[PDB]
Amino acid sequence: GTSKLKYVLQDARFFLIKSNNHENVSLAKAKGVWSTLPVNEKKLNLAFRSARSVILIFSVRESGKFQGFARLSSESHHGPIHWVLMLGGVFKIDWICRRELPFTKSAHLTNPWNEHKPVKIGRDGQEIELECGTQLCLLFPPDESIDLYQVIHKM
């Protein structure tokens, strides 16, 4: 069902993450980590202290799809990850959904924080307004491999 997912997303903040390649998203799914540009890293650190959940929604450039979404479990930290290419700050993340969602299925959602353009459109780090981001996450196929119980107990 969707009740625990709705609880995790309650009063959350949402950010679009754009990766150059599938390899980095695959590494993030295997290792529970993400790194981003310093300008975006500053935004995510601020948001992490500010909200009960910060959700990253991932899209590989040119894929026409989102590849899943995850919750920050830490601010960025330094001191290695073989990313394909700065990306030195490393966030810990808990995956909420590792399934894909094609952009065709989100064509009815627009992001007020990006001029009400379709939510698929935006730069890496673009914030997605609460209602848009919640509805986007709810569109993904349920990921039955994930138990949100341990996620809820970090909030």
Ligand SMILES: CNC(=O)c1cc(-c2ccccc2)n[nH]1
């Ligand atoms: C592991 N992190 C990444 O692969 C990544 C790449 C980017 C980016 C942002 C703007 C222009 C080009 C690439 N952001 N995150």
